Ligand binder design. Structure first.
Ligand code: J1I
Length: 158
């Protein structure tokens, strides 16, 4: 199963955080990175008080069940997610989202695949389009089509 995972960090200095994440993704049991998108600097979706995000996409080969993979992604967000300031630990600044898990459709308490809002999110679609441009969604929609129809702005590389 090729799972596609979206990575986000909004630290002022997220490069170290994202790289630590990609190694942890790589250390997940029965899983390894096939491909990594470029790193992108995106303006945040939401209050524009918070810093710019570093966004990227990752193709992950895995023999894991989807919920099992999720446990792993949430563990990493717990482990690599926060980083120390001198006083205390800071809030977590790693987001690992499962955009797709093979051709599977999933709707549960814990999991919604495809990711529920990725279709309105340029910072998810473009990096993905870079590593899987002929990607077809389980309902037959094409990633290229959705980028075509909405005409999202391209991303500046980080
Ligand atoms: C958006 C916002 C503020 N602005 C941004 N702007 C830019 N430029 N770039 C960004 O990156 C970016 N992201 C920011 C963000 O705040 N991101 C949080 C992502 N956050 C999903 C994490 S899972 C929490 C719960 O979600 C359940 N969950 C359900 N399905 C899945 C799934 N398929 N994969 C993973 N977790 C699943 C899971 O059980 C857990 O308990 C909520 P959401 O944005 O609404 O996606």
């Amino acid at each position: 199963t090729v799972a596609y995972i979206a990575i986000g960090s909004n630290l002022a200095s997220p490069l170290e955080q994202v790289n630590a994440a990609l190694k942890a993704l790589g250390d997940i049991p029965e899983s390894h990175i096939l491909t990594v998108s470029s790193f992108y600097r995106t303006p945040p979706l939401g209050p524009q008080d918070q810093p710019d995000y570093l966004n990227a996409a990752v193709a992950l080969e895995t023999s894991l069940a989807p919920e099992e993979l999720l446990n792993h992604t949430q563990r990493i967000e717990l482990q690599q997610g926060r980083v120390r300031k001198a006083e205390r630990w800071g809030p977590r600044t790693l987001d690992l989202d499962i955009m797709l898990f093979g051709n599977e459709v999933i709707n549960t308490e814990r999991l919604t695949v495809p990711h529920y809002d990725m279709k309105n999110r340029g910072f998810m679609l473009w990096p993905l389009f870079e590593i899987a441009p002929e990607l077809v969604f389980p309902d037959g929609e094409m990633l290229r089509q959705i980028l075509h129809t909405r005409a999202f702005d391209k991303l500046n590389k980080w």
